[PDB]
Design an enzyme around this catalytic site. Sequence first.
Site, PDB file in Angstrom:
ATOM      1  N   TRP A 131       0.843  -1.185   0.000  1.00 52.01           N
ATOM      2  CA  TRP A 131       0.000   0.000   0.000  1.00 52.01           C
ATOM      3  C   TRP A 131       0.886   1.245   0.000  1.00 52.01           C
ATOM      4  O   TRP A 131       1.741   1.381   0.888  1.00 52.01           O
ATOM      5  CB  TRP A 131      -0.914  -0.027   1.224  1.00 52.01           C
ATOM      6  CG  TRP A 131      -1.977   1.035   1.261  1.00 52.01           C
ATOM      7  CD1 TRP A 131      -2.832   1.381   0.256  1.00 52.01           C
ATOM      8  CD2 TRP A 131      -2.315   1.865   2.379  1.00 52.01           C
ATOM      9  NE1 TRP A 131      -3.675   2.384   0.675  1.00 52.01           N
ATOM     10  CE2 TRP A 131      -3.378   2.698   1.975  1.00 52.01           C
ATOM     11  CE3 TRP A 131      -1.819   1.988   3.682  1.00 52.01           C
ATOM     12  CZ2 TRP A 131      -3.951   3.643   2.826  1.00 52.01           C
ATOM     13  CZ3 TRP A 131      -2.390   2.925   4.524  1.00 52.01           C
ATOM     14  CH2 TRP A 131      -3.444   3.741   4.093  1.00 52.01           C
ATOM     15  N   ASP A 212      -1.175  -5.423   9.464  1.00 47.69           N
ATOM     16  CA  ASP A 212      -2.143  -4.504   8.874  1.00 47.69           C
ATOM     17  C   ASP A 212      -3.322  -5.345   8.393  1.00 47.69           C
ATOM     18  O   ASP A 212      -3.174  -6.171   7.486  1.00 47.69           O
ATOM     19  CB  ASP A 212      -1.512  -3.704   7.735  1.00 47.69           C
ATOM     20  CG  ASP A 212      -2.425  -2.609   7.212  1.00 47.69           C
ATOM     21  OD1 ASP A 212      -3.655  -2.705   7.411  1.00 47.69           O
ATOM     22  OD2 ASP A 212      -1.911  -1.650   6.598  1.00 47.69           O
ATOM     23  N   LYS A 247     -13.959  -1.201   5.217  1.00 48.71           N
ATOM     24  CA  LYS A 247     -14.324  -1.960   4.029  1.00 48.71           C
ATOM     25  C   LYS A 247     -15.253  -3.132   4.323  1.00 48.71           C
ATOM     26  O   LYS A 247     -16.249  -3.311   3.616  1.00 48.71           O
ATOM     27  CB  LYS A 247     -13.044  -2.433   3.330  1.00 48.71           C
ATOM     28  CG  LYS A 247     -12.128  -1.258   2.983  1.00 48.71           C
ATOM     29  CD  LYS A 247     -10.796  -1.696   2.429  1.00 48.71           C
ATOM     30  CE  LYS A 247      -9.872  -0.508   2.213  1.00 48.71           C
ATOM     31  NZ  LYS A 247     -10.370   0.406   1.149  1.00 48.71           N
TER      32      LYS A 247
HETATM   33  C1  LIG Z   1      -3.501  -2.596   3.523  1.00 45.94           C
HETATM   34  C2  LIG Z   1      -4.253  -1.357   3.912  1.00 45.94           C
HETATM   35  N1  LIG Z   1      -3.970  -0.745   5.113  1.00 45.94           N
HETATM   36  C3  LIG Z   1      -4.649   0.392   5.489  1.00 45.94           C
HETATM   37  C4  LIG Z   1      -5.628   0.938   4.668  1.00 45.94           C
HETATM   38  C5  LIG Z   1      -6.318   2.196   5.151  1.00 45.94           C
HETATM   39  O1  LIG Z   1      -7.506   1.905   5.851  1.00 45.94           O
HETATM   40  P1  LIG Z   1      -8.474   3.123   6.266  1.00 45.94           P
HETATM   41  O2  LIG Z   1      -9.108   3.715   5.029  1.00 45.94           O
HETATM   42  O3  LIG Z   1      -9.557   2.589   7.170  1.00 45.94           O
HETATM   43  O4  LIG Z   1      -7.668   4.187   6.976  1.00 45.94           O
HETATM   44  C6  LIG Z   1      -5.922   0.328   3.442  1.00 45.94           C
HETATM   45  C7  LIG Z   1      -6.876   0.939   2.450  1.00 45.94           C
HETATM   46  O5  LIG Z   1      -7.787   1.671   2.826  1.00 45.94           O
HETATM   47  C8  LIG Z   1      -5.225  -0.823   3.071  1.00 45.94           C
HETATM   48  O6  LIG Z   1      -5.495  -1.449   1.880  1.00 45.94           O
END
Ligand SMILES: Cc1ncc(COP(=O)(O)O)c(C=O)c1O
Lengths: 397, 397
Positions: A131, A212, A247
């Site tokens: 990411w 994560d 999500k």
């Molecule tokens: C692997 C990963 N970590 C963290 C996030 C961020 O999450 P959030 O939108 O709830 O902050 C995402 C995408 O949103 C992601 O794909």
Amino acid sequence: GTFENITAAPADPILGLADLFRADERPGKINLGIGVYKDETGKTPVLTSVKKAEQYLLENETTKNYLGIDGIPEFGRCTQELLFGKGSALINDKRARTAQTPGGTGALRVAADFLAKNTSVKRVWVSNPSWPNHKSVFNSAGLEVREYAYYDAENHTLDFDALINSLNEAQAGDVVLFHGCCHNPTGIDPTLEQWQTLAQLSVEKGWLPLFDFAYQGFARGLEEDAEGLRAFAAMHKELIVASSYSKNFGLYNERVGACTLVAADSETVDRAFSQMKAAIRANYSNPPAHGASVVATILSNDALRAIWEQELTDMRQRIQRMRQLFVNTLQEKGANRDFSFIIKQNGMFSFSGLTKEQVLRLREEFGVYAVASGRVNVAGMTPDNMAPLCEAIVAVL
Amino acid sequence: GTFENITAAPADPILGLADLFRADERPGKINLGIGVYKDETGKTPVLTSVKKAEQYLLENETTKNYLGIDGIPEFGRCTQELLFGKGSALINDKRARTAQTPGGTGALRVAADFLAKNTSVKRVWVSNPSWPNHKSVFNSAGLEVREYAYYDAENHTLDFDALINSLNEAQAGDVVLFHGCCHNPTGIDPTLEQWQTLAQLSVEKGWLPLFDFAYQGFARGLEEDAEGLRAFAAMHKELIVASSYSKNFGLYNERVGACTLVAADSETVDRAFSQMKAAIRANYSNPPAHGASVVATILSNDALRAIWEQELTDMRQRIQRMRQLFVNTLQEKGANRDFSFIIKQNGMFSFSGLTKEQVLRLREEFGVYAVASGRVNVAGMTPDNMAPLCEAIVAVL
Ligand SMILES: Cc1ncc(COP(=O)(O)O)c(C=O)c1O
Ligand SMILES: *Cc1c(COP(=O)(O)O)cnc(C)c1O
């Protein structure tokens, strides 16, 4: 002039792509960039369980008084059960403390601030690719970011030999970040046996693992998607879990996440957690209530939860149907390549294998928007937009 | 182990008290600690305008898709009108950009991060006393925090002569933090002509002013409380404003704030604002929607806004009535110390003038909880608890 010499920042590779899509005038645009779920009709709806939970909150909330620094207690309890299991020993031994955070991103920054300011940690290992925002979050907290191998582009698979070799350079005390499931952007997760190999290799070399967890429930199932984590949990004295409900609950803009801290015993985790609460106090003070209240209400009510588990199952299964339909339709529109590897990838994304020049041409000439790395959001595909989408991909091959 | 070397964090001077209060088992306790408003029944209710707005959102929200990094556009527009005036030159010249942030704390933290990475600012000047979390927020970004004199503890007045002298060593490019109104914890604000002197001295010395606006509408009114800010805004090329809706909308736990950037011209502020967005992205990605949607709904709807403005007047006038009743009951209960200065101070807080020893005695001897600095929350006083707590104070004098 204090602001006169500031340099403009570059565009975000994900969110900068979204602003372009919103500005594009052509009526047949297709957005396959940001990881947001769409139903068969192309919309990103509010879940029924969420709407019902919000109605309960509207008619029963008596105050908006501040939450505690760590947030709603029931929210933290339900999060730990989802991660570790109903009767987990981490929970019974009181080894885990959870803070409600603004999203998964907020959970990552809290952990990063906590580490950089209270420990000797100075290095974070992140998969290559990963990411894009991972590097930015940890660098901004003052931590160095190193990359380890992950993806085999020739075989479209996980290069477990390169991963182990690259991570041999990780010294003791370093932090190694793992995607719990639905690896972003490759969609290739380790097998349970591979997880166990990493868990054993993790304790031997003295790593502080950081998980994560943004897509629990999108690969195989709630319990199934946490197997890798629970393998590390059964073997480590310390670990950090940043998780997101954006999500699997469709609560993106309410920023609902958690940062869970695990230590060897209850005394050490409470001592470390006090410093985590201090890093939160100096950031946003206390977390937003609405989104986390919905999640806690749903998970606490067996009727609502039953609806949610069924809504999440439909999301997972619709994405699987689009993966199949995507591969079959590519063959039908004249694609010479074999795209079968897309069927074996988990989650919302797929590494299509398109080059930066092809991704760029898809956008300018056909109005199909993907991230420059060739990552496409399968959950953005519908029966309607599948044919035009595949016709454009075949045109740039 | 990585967490075993961690040192436990001390108790928050404000939150460490409210935890010690919820534990206390005595009947009739009184909490004059945290800065939350209460009505005459001792409760912190949701405003009627907020419930109406939340009902409208429940019925009309079609998606929870991510907001932009800077949040709801209409929320930022209405914020600038509140701060600078309906037809300000700052807005027409497009010199100001606003980011929606998680509360006033979030806005301060975003500014601290922004300044630390992108400018040569190394030092923030904060009043002594001030909100205790100011030092923690700016320190979290590595900024040195110096203190300037403010409170005349003899006359219970602003020590303007000492304020000027103590800021003599504030260099050009230093940040100087000002409470927009209802100074926390003293409740003593500069006069309009005192504001004017400060604005004139700030521009000659080259300071970067940073206004913390958490209580707009609690001193005299929405427009009057911003006169100090607007005196600065008419003379400065650059300034920062961190504002909060936690207290004037009763949205504490939804985390609704705003960081507003002002530069010399539209091209400069856009350039600087892009780096502010980068710092938000690496912290919490994007802000929570529910609370800010409520505020934008109310401020954009004339019917709801007239309700809110009346609810805010109700809150302001009740606080001023408790200030009068507090002074009168102290006399009735036999106090010989003159507490008339309470009537002159603005907002929810005032320095009672009690010693730390007297504060400790009130807490463990009568069940009355105030912060160890002697700050009391006047909005925590009701007609039902006024006589008991006044009897308590007189006893420890
Ligand atoms: C692997 C990963 N970590 C963290 C996030 C961020 O999450 P959030 O939108 O709830 O902050 C995402 C995408 O949103 C992601 O794909
Ligand atoms: C209460 C307060 C804040 C915090 O605002 P939040 O919206 O709760 O984050 C910031 N500054 C001052 C002066 C305050 O009194």
